[PDB]
């Protein structure tokens, strides 16, 4: 919910910065001169940057060796069909490259197989000047490397086509991460319109980073493969380590936990990693069931949680959610819900992004007005 | 091993035990594809394979010109 707190950083800024330098007069000549004897060399450009440059396809050599004796003459010798089909096979990659650049106007994401094959991506990702642990992480999970990469059209001139691929750099490895899921916590009185609700707005990923906690408010953007959480620090907040204190005492004075309030008590369910949170309200009927045994549990009004052991589907009203059958141990912490401590006559239910301190001071101001 | 904890007091659940792979910076690499300097094809043969080669070279030249437009 806190996605509006991010700063608007241009992701393609580095790639377009390198691309702009290559547009300067003479830089393409330097790229050709440095790549003259080898397939990979680091070139120092006018900006002072040193970027590794690689050549991935040379259709010039193929054409100038095989097709010049055939099509560049008056008395054309008849080519074999093997040459024709080999030419389509070799040129197909360039046709898909140009098609993707045409459709996406020269900035493509994710990096497709035509932008960079997996063998060339593995070679280039091993050739980066980085630590061995980073190389191991990158090589074992190249698909998320593709999903977090851009390919930027740069130049086409002097018989040279160039596009700048922009691989991610994972500067943080194996720090502990945890995902916070949140469901609306509401009262359960029988009167329809007297209900008040409270929802923690700080749902999303958290990962340790250099003595602070990187909070990622958009959980859908972060990819998860098995036990590993692939996130981006560009769309992240930096938070003090007091943010951990919200999960054990939401009323702690060191860090004000962020919540939103309303009065729309809707029956909803949040499928967590190892269970399901169901918040059944009003006259809605909510149950958790086993695929073979039928209904095994019925939820009373309020906030409740069911483990993934035994349960295969969960139904809340007319919508059915499937629970994750991941292996793992789940714990239920009994406690009085915090919504019962608020006076319904003075509860401020008009906040879209607030905190416990803001709600408390608003309640205090409302009591002072009385 | 991933462990999950539910808090009834705040109606929230934390799933902990994950390992980070946070992207902090960018690495920019310049990828080059060398293109032929063909000006025009002067072949006038009516053979079907020559026509196929001309068609594929025509769409290749159209792709090169389209990249030059970009």
């Amino acid at each position, epitope marked *: 919910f806190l996605g509006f707190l991010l700063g608007v950083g241009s992701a393609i800024a580095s790639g377009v910065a390198v691309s702009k330098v290559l547009h300067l007069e003479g830089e393409v000549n330097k790229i050709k001169s440095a790549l003259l004897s080898t397939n990979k060399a680091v070139v120092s450009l006018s900006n002072g940057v040193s970027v590794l440059t690689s050549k991935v396809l040379d259709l010039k050599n193929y054409i100038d060796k095989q097709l010049l004796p055939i099509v560049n003459k008056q008395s054309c010798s008849i080519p074999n069909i093997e040459t024709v089909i080999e030419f389509q096979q070799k040129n197909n990659r360039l046709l898909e490259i140009t098609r993707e650049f045409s459709v996406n106007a020269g900035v493509t994401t994710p990096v497709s197989t035509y932008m960079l094959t997996n063998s060339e991506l593995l070679s280039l990702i091993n050739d980066m000047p980085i630590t061995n642990d980073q190389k191991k992480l990158m090589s074992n999970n190249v698909q998320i490397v593709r999903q977090q990469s851009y390919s930027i059209m740069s130049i086409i001139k002097e018989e040279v086509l160039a596009y700048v691929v922009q691989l991610p750099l994972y500067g943080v490895i194996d720090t502990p991460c945890w995902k916070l899921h949140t469901s609306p916590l509401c009262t359960t009185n029988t009167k329809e319109g007297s209900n008040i609700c409270l929802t923690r707005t700080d749902r999303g990923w958290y990962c340790d980073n250099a003595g602070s906690v990187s909070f990622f408010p958009q959980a859908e953007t972060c990819k998860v493969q098995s036990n590993r959480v692939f996130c981006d620090t560009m769309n992240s907040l930096t938070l003090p*380590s007091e943010v*951990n204190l919200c999960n054990v005492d939401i009323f702690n*004075p060191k860090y004000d936990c962020k919540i939103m309030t309303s009065k729309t008590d809707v029956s909803s369910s949040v499928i967590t990693s190892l269970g399901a949170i169901v918040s059944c309200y009003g006259k809605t009927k909510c149950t958790a069931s086993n695929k073979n045994r039928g209904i095994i549990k019925t939820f009373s009004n309020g906030c409740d949680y069911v483990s993934n052991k035994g349960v295969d589907t969960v139904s809340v009203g007319n919508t059915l959610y499937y629970v994750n059958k991941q292996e793992g141990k789940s*714990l239920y912490v009994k406690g009085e819900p915090i919504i019962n401590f608020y006076d319904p006559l003075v509860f401020p239910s008009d906040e879209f992004d607030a905190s416990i301190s803001q709600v408390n001071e608003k309640i205090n101001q409302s009591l002072a007005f009385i | 091993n991933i*462990t999950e904890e539910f808090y009834q007091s705040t109606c929230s659940a*934390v799933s902990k035990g994950y390992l980070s792979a946070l992207r902090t910076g960018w690495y920019t690499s310049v990828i080059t594809i060398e293109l032929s300097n063909i000006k025009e094809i002067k072949c006038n043969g009516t053979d079907a394979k020559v026509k196929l080669i001309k068609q594929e070279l025509d769409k290749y030249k159209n792709a090169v010109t389209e990249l030059q437009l970009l």
Partner: antibody
Amino acid sequence: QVQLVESGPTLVKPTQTLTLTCSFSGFSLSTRGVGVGWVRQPPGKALECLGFTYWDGDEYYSPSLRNRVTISKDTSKNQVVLTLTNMDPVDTATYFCVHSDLYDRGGYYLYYFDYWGQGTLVTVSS
Amino acid sequence: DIRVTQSPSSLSASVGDRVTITCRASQTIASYVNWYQQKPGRAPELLIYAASILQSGVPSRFSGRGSGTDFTLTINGLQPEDFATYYCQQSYSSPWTFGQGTKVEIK
């Protein structure tokens, strides 16, 4: 190295006020995570906390006797002052000055007691 | 308050045996338990840093495990110097209460 030495009277008449001074070295009270407090142990009984001063100035006590125990800190004088009034015979315990650090990473905020002072004995006798 | 009491109060063991001290909480808490070993006439020392992680500067023989209501401390390879009283501390919510302790005894 961290050093923690207690000093104060060992015999105090009942109903009067008992005070303790804890001298520390090798660490600064204003360093993040560092906190100092007191844990007492009656003979043949369990331990029990009294109250803790933290780096950021926060303060609390055990609610059973929070109205009776008060601790003041002096970073400039490198001393920690513990005060407790209305000395009861049940209060006869070995009072330990204690250093604390917090487990910052992993999603925890756990204040453990890593370094313990040698402890002084206070006897409430007539 | 969240009271913690230890079921084995005066267990006895010999060198080479396995000792498991069980501390039970009044309600479900995830970790936030500490283990202190107090020699007679000496100050206690931290051994278990949090549930299932060791404190630095203590012998590696000690190991911890536990989450929820019951926490267990596993000692492998007892030594004659291990004769001491072990305490479990609850810290999930203020105030921090200590258990009655386990007066381990040697045969």
